[PDB]
Design a protein around this ligand. Structure first.
Ligand SMILES: CCCCCCCCCCC1=C(C)C(=O)C(OC)=C(OC)C1=O
Ligand code: SF4
Ligand code: SF4
Ligand code: SF4
Ligand code: SF4
Ligand code: FES
Ligand SMILES: [Ca+2]
Lengths: 905, 198, 588
């Protein structure tokens, strides 16, 4: 298409509206109610341009650019005098009732309304009457509510209801008393409610966790990082002030997590700011806890390790690829152990084998939204991989999108699309042990034990392709549901099969692989998605190693007299009594970690490792994409006594001191080169981000905005002499504003989005090639493996049906977005959001045991009696008991295990 | 409370030795000869203090020697440029004991607004300073106030009377800070004149 | 059409003359808000274009400015040639009352330009500074050494990849530079500085710095002497380099104003004026008449302050030590008025983008009237007591004389240029800030620029500034002290305190900065010591992409060896006292 804006000719996409076409060309049109992810509604009337009928036209007509297609041969004017007057008048109308609140508003300096008020040139007030006011609501611990600042742009309700699928937010009232909020006070129930603080262009919805320790956007130190709270790998911009992690913003990645995070990634960062974190290396001598610097710790650890006969290392899926590799090189490949359990490791390696040997393409998170039918087997996606659940909701609304596209309705005309596709949606079939948060949009939900869900998957695969192994003993009603699923999957151009390791069943993953293979054999464009547990679960699976049980066996038998535990509390993957016994028997325990874990009581040495905010590294997400995260701030800038280094730096220096009795710390790219030289499967992590010599026309990449303040006063109470600016030898970023953050700079790692005149998250428009698309010079991150040329064989081992045995209770895993991830529990804001931990019981089993709802029952696992209250789970199958995985005292390894002597206390 | 140079020590102060030390300190604090050294705009305000409207000669501090040998006070009145820093250090080294240093202005205090590639961030990075004057520039009476502060500091320091007899260490008084001294009268301020008048 | 409008200046006769001489395709005309024709010339045609402009019927006789720009980070380069770096040449024709800016584009690897020193001799120091701060080599230059940074300096500070901030202080580097200071007298080679015949067996060498007990600053001159005669002299400058242009790239448009104060630190609001006028050209702001009169009043008060200091220090340098006390009393009267209006003495930082910081306080006219009654009898007393002294005349008359051609070829402006009979004052030739509404004369000399002639011209300029101040006192317009433009930074304070849109504008203007659309602007004013100019390049951000400050003291200090060669050293001291320079103006 060809458009003419203000006498200049441009080539645009004809499927776009005029607003996104002009914003992609670098033109500045003010807008409020339009969002790239939500479509156009034409509410705020801010995006007015003057459209002419032909080239020789003087009158024209004011039109909404967001509602007008950018068709070929269009003629418009942005800087027309009447259009400018109308846009200024719209801003003026919005300013009539706006409160005098910018100094005490958390959106100040990050406010889209401020930017568009300045952009239209409106600074003179002639309105002299009263301003309407509103009472606020309590929206929970994460979102602060202030309805005075609302401009009634309807973006919150559109995102929360139409996009996110939430139900407890709405618009109430009438003409100018429109109220946006909940029908009553209470916590916002959506797992993606935190994106309201970026969706809302004003300060109505704000980050309450940030508002506690508030600072302005210009005062932040930002870095591009990866969220560490599950395996999805959403790109984030952590921002720090005065030595503490202040905020997590969404960092745009057009391939992964484009505009949206989940609430666990946005508000679960509080463990970084915990006061009990180790800040110096501490050596235990008797009952004394002496504090060492880095060189003394390295020398003492090297001497004690050189005296030992066999030192083993226990990695973790929390740690980055470089730290796990450095531990593996320090202890040797034969002595390196992945810190996860044997069953967890088996499921993880099966998921990796399916992903990189099954011959079926695995989609990125943005690509999930383009699929035609979704079968979720075993994985409670909303509680373990939440952003995949949001993308699945978009893929489900794809049917209404296609139905509207059949009627020549443009993709940005979202109201017409939703009107045409009223309640029709793409098929979604979810299986779990109980109800899920995807059940409202699911075409069918199967509540069954993991063996029965695996059997349903195997039966679906057999019905799609008769070469697959058959399932014997299917009830005719379940057979009819299976035929419904098969007819929906076979008629789909792009089916998607989603499973993962969180179900605790190998057979569920095998069944999902069989369904994907059966759909691939029919010529479908099938995709498969495995949801792993932790941020670097896939990297630890690719690296490999022994299980935690083998390491504990080596410690208990005495063949190993030294253990180095890297960023692992060890209680989530093995029983606590066994771990404590094996660590108490070992004459040397060295724990390299950034969180105060329970195994440090038995540790002879504790190395104060850095968290993700104070470290650089690489993590591999659930789709196999290698992504680099960069250090946000120097921990030693304020507290000069803090010795908190990267885990790979600690382990590389320890290896150097063990070998040559000399301390060499490392450089990060040196460790990257060592990884890609020793482990060829991880060779793609070299291209995840450029090395430390990368420059933009000779200069580094700035971590903080140009107007960063207080540089001669932020540390002036400690000493009036300004300290040396922290050097970054590891990465291309600088710990200062003396760098480049231009939107046109040839790079993929963007620490934060700012452009002149665009201070809000709408500056990401300036950082994209086209608005709502990818980043201008490619999205960061590189897939480690391609789709295999040939696939796997059918998994023959179909499990038998679940049989409730007397005296044994099968543990059904219940995951919680606030409480199952290890480090996010440590965040103090999650305790008010984390549910009180009960145990789920069938009504039949609870009536058999004589227990009601709320009474306390006690059960023993591994010879340890613990007591919990009871809820009655109607959807849970009898013979099973439901437990909240990852909570305090309940390890995720308990999923799929059995329970004894469960009785009322 | 004193600081020793040759340590946080106490007062070493016969009653005739104390009287002789008081006489020497009186003569030194009442005859302070600054070194005529121009760095930047702060020097313009310093020599403004030397003129008739302010008359710093009343304190006996006007002689303004062009030679560092004859000067007792160095006023760093201006920015410490990196090319001028060895010059400043050499001129300070050519001064003879006893010698005192006044940093005048934000540049000499800390680098001021010039946190820049060619400016040393404060003269106390390389030479010791006795009195600091904030301002950009400090007004001439601020320089005279710093001169009186230096006189108070000189008036109760301890230096050897002769180089052949007695303790040769230099004891400098650990003064109470002017901020904590004036905090009582400064916080009690309630109303000021409105800025719409003269 | 407003005065800040973007123009190509294709109606300028120099564009037609260049088109007729070199061809339509030989250059590219750039539309700017500088007010001058900006012409991009090929590098191989630069000397031909300069010669052609030098031999015009009303020729371009003065190289006003010459510097560089790092174009690598410049995003809005529409209508511009491909350039990693660029070198600009600002040339002034006084007979046409016109000026032209030639621009040469340079690739990153090929950073060399032919020298301009054969056409204009002030290109020597200008090209030395361009080499020092940008790394651009000038072929054929007689001595292309560093002029701001020391000789053992790594990198070029005005490049965009050079970090602006102060590095970590090291006592080892200070001790090393002290060792070079002590060994400079032993390892002095008289060829690196551009001299020849380094000891005819009688040419001694003298050093006059870098500890100068005077208000003009501290800088070294190394003198080659035949007895008492100055055979040759080169000045060593850069001892007062503050990186002010680099800070112009590191501060917002509003927060840079106090740095503009400290360029010529005896000037104050006079230094603020060209910066805020150029920013207002970038912003498209036309200030009201009351703003023009207020800024003119403060500029003339500070001009009288600077002239009083200059005359008193010259009289002190001759040997009469008394009038400086009374002159500083008059400076205190001026400072009473300036303290009342702006709250500060020497660096008021009171001008704003779109106006001034506050309204005039009630009762200012009484202080202005008291100073206007105080000044003339004191000025006449200074004249009769020192300026008519025949010993002072014998020290000053005929010392360091030059004519109109020498002043033109060295870029001399101010009283030194006008003492040669060339009537060129910016307040009349290129009027700004409503100077056309005032009745004042421009004093000119007979044709010779002596020390005494320059001093008497500055006395007459002081009297004319008193006349302007009298007109300012009698005719004060009633109106706003800030423009009603949306880019007026900051907005009026009461509307900020009670109106939300004004509060939003203030919030974003003082924090992120006002957003100037991408353009180039230029403002030239008659400062207290000559012609001062700000050339500002905006890339569309809240910070200046390039802040180029042309100061007259640089040109006068470069003119020194051409005017003092063959004189005595006491004559050199008198010449330095009569130049009216400060070293912050030279180095900046
Ligand atoms: C102790 C005996 C002193 C006798 C007189 C000394 C010389 C005159 C006063 C000092 C002085 C000098 C040298 C001087 O040069 C000067 O001009 C800068 C002054 O005014 C600020 C002075 O006050
Ligand atoms: S929402 Fe924006 S315009 Fe409104 S008070 Fe907050 S910062 Fe100011
Ligand atoms: S609360 Fe925010 S997002 Fe919702 S309509 Fe109001 S301004 Fe828009
Ligand atoms: S979905 Fe996972 S990776 Fe993404 S924000 Fe949530 S916890 Fe972080
Ligand atoms: S502190 Fe201010 S007035 Fe003093 S030298 Fe520095 S810039 Fe000049
Ligand atoms: S953005 Fe088009 S009317 Fe709101
Ligand atoms: Ca690092």
């Amino acid at each position: 298409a060809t458009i003419h804006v203000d006498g200049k000719e441009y080539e645009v996409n004809g499927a776009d509206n005029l607003l996104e076409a002009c914003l992609s060309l670098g033109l500045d049109i003010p807008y409020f109610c339009w969002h790239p992810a939500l479509g156009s509604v034409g509410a705020c009337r801010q995006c007015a341009v003057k459209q002419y009928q032909n080239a020789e036209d003087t009158r024209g007509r004011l039109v909404m650019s967001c509602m007008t297609p950018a068709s070929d041969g269009t003629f418009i004017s942005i800087d027309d005098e009447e259009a400018k007057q109308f846009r200024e008048s719209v801003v003026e109308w919005l300013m009539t009732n706006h409160p005098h609140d910018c100094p005490v508003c958390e959106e100040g300096g990050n406010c889209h309304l401020q930017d568009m008020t300045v952009m239209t040139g409106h600074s003179f007030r002639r309105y002299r009457f009263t301003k309407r006011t509103h009472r606020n609501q309590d929206l929970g611990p994460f979102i602060s509510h202030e309805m005075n600042r609302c401009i009634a742009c309807y973006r919150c309700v559109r995102y929360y209801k139409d996009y996110a699928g939430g139900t407890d937010l709405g618009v109430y009232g009438a003409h100018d008393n429109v109220y946006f909020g909940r029908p009553e006070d209470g916590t916002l129930e959506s797992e993606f409610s935190g994106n309201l603080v970026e969706i809302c262009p004003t300060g109505v919805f704000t980050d309450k966790t940030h508002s506690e320790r508030y600072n302005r956007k210009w005062d932040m130190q930002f870095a591009p990082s990866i969220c560490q709270q599950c395996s999805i790998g959403c790109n984030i911009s952590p921002g720090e002030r005065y030595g503490e992690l202040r905020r997590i913003e969404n960092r745009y990645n057009g391939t992964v997590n484009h505009y949206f995070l989940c609430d666990r990634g946005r508000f679960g960062y509080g463990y970084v700011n915990l006061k009990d974190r180790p800040r110096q290396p501490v050596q235990r001598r008797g009952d004394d806890f002496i504090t060492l610097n880095a060189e003394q710790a390295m020398q003492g650890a090297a001497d004690i390790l050189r005296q030992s006969k066999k030192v083993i290392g226990i990695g973790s899926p929390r740690a980055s690829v470089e730290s796990n590799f450095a531990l593996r090189e320090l202890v040797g490949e034969e002595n390196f152990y992945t810190g996860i359990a044997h069953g967890e490791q088996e499921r993880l390696q099966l998921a990796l084998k399916v992903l990189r040997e099954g011959g079926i393409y695995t989609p990125a998170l943005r690509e999930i939204e383009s699929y035609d039918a979704v079968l979720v087997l075993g994985e409670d996606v909303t509680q373990t991989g939440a952003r995949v659940a949001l993308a699945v909701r978009q893929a489900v609304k794809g049917k209404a999108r296609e139905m509207a596209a059949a009627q020549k309705v443009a993709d940005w005309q979202i109201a017409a699309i939703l009107n045409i596709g009223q309640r029709a949606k793409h098929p979604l079939f979810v299986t779990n042990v109980d109800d899920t948060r995807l059940d409202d949009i699911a075409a069918w939900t199967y509540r069954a034990p993991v063996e029965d869900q695996a059997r349903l998957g195997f039966a679906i695969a057999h019905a799609l392709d008769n070469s697959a192994p058959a399932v014997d003993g299917i009830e005719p009603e379940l057979q009819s549901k299976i035929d419904v699923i098969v007819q929906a999957l076979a008629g789909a151009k792009k089916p998607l099969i989603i499973s993962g390791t969180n179900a605790g069943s190998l057979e569920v993953i095998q069944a999902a692989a069989n369904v994907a293979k059966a759909l691939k054999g029919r010529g479908a464009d099938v995709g498969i998605t495995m949801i792993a547990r932790s941020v670097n679960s896939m990297g630890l699976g690719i690296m490999g190693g022994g299980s935690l049980e083998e390491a504990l066996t080596e410690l208990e038998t005495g063949r190993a007299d030294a253990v180095v535990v890297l960023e692992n509390d060890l209680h989530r993957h093995a029983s606590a009594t066994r771990v404590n016994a094996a660590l108490a028997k070992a004459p040397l325990v060295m724990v390299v970690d950034h969180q105060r874990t329970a195994i440090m009581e038995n540790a002879h040495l504790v190395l104060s490792a850095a968290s993700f905010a104070e470290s650089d590294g690489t993590v591999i997400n659930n789709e196999g994409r290698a992504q680099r995260f960069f250090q946000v701030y120097d921990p030693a800038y304020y507290d000069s006594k803090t010795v908190m280094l990267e885990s790979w730096r600690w382990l590389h220096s320890l290896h150097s001191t063990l070998l040559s009795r000399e301390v060499d710390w490392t450089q990060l790219d040196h460790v990257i080169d060592a990884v890609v030289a020793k482990i060829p499967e991880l060779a793609g992590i070299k291209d995840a981000a450029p090395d430390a010599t990368f420059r933009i026309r000779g200069q580094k990449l700035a971590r903080e905005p140009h107007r960063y303040s207080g540089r001669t006063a932020m540390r002036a109470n400690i000493s009036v002499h300004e300290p040396r600016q922290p050097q970054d030898i590891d990465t291309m970023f600088t710990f200062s504003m003396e760098g480049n953050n231009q939107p046109t700079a040839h790079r993929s790692q963007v620490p934060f989005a700012w452009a002149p005149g665009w201070n809000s998250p709408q500056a990401w428009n300036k950082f994209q090639d086209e608005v709502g698309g990818k980043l201008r010079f490619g999205d960061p991150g590189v897939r480690l493996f391609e789709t295999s040329e040939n696939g796997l064989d059918y998994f023959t081992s179909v499990p038998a049906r679940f049989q409730p045995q007397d005296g044994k209770w099968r543990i059904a895993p219940y995951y919680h977005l606030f409480g199952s991830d290890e480090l996010s529990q440590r965040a103090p804001v999650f305790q008010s959001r984390m549910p009180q931990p009960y145990i789920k019981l069938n009504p039949a089993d609870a009536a058999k045991l004589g227990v009601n709802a709320g009474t306390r029952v006690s059960f023993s696992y591994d010879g340890n009696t613990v007591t919990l209250p009871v809820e009655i789970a109607e959807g849970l199958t009898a013979g099973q008991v439901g437990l909240p995985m990852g909570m305090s005292g309940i390890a995720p390894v308990l999923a799929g295990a059995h329970l004894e002597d469960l009785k009322e206390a | 409370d004193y600081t020793l140079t040759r340590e946080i020590v106490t007062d070493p102060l016969n009653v005739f030795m104390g009287k002789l030390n008081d006489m020497v300190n009186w003569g030194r604090k009442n005859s302070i000869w600054p070194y005529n050294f121009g760095l930047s705009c702060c020097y313009v305000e310093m020599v403004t203090s030397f003129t008739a409207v302010h008359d710093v000669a009343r304190f006996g501090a006007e002689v303004l020697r062009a030679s560092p040998r004859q000067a007792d006070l160095m006023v760093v009145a201006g920015t410490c440029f990196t090319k001028m820093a060895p010059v400043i250090q050499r001129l300070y080294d050519q001064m003879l004991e006893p010698k005192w240093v006044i940093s005048m202005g934000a540049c000499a205090n800390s680098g001021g607004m010039y946190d820049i590639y060619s400016v040393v961030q404060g003269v106390d990075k390389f030479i010791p300073v006795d009195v600091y004057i904030p301002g950009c520039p400090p007004r001439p009476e601020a320089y005279m106030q710093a001169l009186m502060l230096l006189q108070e500091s000189i008036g109760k320091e301890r230096r050897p009377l002769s180089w052949v007899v007695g303790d040769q260490g230099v004891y400098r008084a650990n003064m109470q800070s002017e901020r904590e001294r004036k905090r009582g009268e400064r916080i009690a301020v309630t109303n000021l004149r409105t800025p719409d008048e003269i | 059409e407003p005065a800040w409008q973007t123009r190509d200046h294709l109606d300028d006769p120099v564009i037609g003359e260049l088109r007729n001489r070199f061809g339509p395709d030989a250059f590219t005309v750039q539309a700017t808000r500088t007010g001058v024709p900006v012409v991009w010339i090929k590098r191989e045609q630069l000397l031909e274009v300069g010669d052609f402009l030098k031999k015009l019927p009303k020729p371009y006789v003065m190289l006003f400015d010459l510097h560089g720009m790092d174009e690598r980070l410049r995003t809005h380069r529409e209508g511009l040639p491909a350039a990693d770096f660029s070198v600009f040449y600002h040339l002034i024709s006084i007979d046409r009352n016109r000026d032209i800016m030639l621009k040469v584009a340079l690739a990153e690897n090929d950073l060399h330009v032919p020298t301009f020193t054969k056409l204009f001799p002030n290109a020597n120091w200008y090209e030395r500074e361009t080499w020092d701060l940008f790394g651009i080599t000038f072929d054929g230059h007689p001595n292309l050494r560093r002029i701001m940074m020391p000789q053992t300096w790594k990198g070029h500070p005005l490049r965009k990849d050079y970090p602006a901030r102060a590095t970590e202080f090291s006592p080892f580097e200070l001790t090393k530079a002290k060792q070079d200071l002590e060994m400079e007298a032993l390892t002095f080679k008289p060829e690196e500085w551009g001299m020849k015949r380094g000891t005819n067996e009688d040419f001694m060498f003298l050093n006059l710095g870098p500890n100068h007990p005077s208000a003009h600053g501290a800088f070294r001159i190394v003198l080659q002497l035949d007895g008492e005669e100055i055979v040759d002299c080169v000045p060593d400058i850069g001892y007062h380099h503050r990186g002010a242009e680099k800070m112009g790239e590191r501060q917002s448009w509003h927060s840079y104003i106090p740095y503009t104060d400290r360029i010529e630190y005896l000037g104050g609001c006079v230094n603020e004026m060209p910066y805020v006028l150029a920013v207002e050209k970038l912003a498209g702001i036309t200030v009201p008449d009351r703003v023009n009169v207020i800024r003119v009043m403060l500029s003339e008060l500070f001009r009288i302050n600077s002239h009083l200091l200059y005359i008193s220090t010259f009289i002190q340098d001759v040997g009469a030590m008394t009038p400086v006390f009374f002159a500083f009393t008059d400076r205190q009267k001026i400072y009473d008025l300036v303290e009342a209006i702006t709250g500060f003495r020497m660096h008021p930082a009171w001008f704003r983008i779109g106006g001034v910081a506050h309204d005039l306080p009630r009762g200012w006219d009484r202080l202005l009237r008291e100073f206007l009654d105080w000044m003339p009898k004191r000025l006449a007393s200074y004249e009769k007591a020192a300026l008519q002294n025949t010993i002072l005349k014998g020290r000053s008359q005929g010392v360091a004389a030059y004519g109109a051609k020498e002043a033109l070829e060295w870029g001399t402006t101010g009283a030194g240029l006008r003492a040669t009979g060339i009537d060129f004052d910016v307040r009349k030739a290129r009027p700004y800030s409503g100077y056309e509404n005032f009745d004042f004369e421009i004093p000119v000399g007979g044709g010779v620029s002596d020390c005494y002639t320059r001093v008497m011209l500055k006395v007459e300029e002081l009297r004319q500034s008193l006349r302007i101040l009298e007109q300012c006192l009698n005719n004060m317009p009633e109106g706003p002290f800030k423009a009603d433009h949306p880019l007026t930074t900051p907005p009026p304070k009461e509307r900020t305190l009670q109106h939300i849109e004004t509060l939003i504008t203030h919030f974003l203007q003082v924090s992120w900065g006002p957003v100037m659309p991408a353009n180039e602007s230029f403002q030239m004013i008659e400062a207290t010591k000559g012609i001062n100019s700000y050339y500002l390049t905006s890339d569309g951000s809240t910070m200046s992409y390039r802040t180029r400050i042309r100061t007259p003291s640089y040109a006068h200090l470069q003119q020194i060896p051409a005017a003092i060669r063959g004189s005595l050293v006491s004559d050199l001291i008198v010449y330095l006292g009569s130049i009216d320079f400060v070293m912050s103006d030279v180095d900046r």
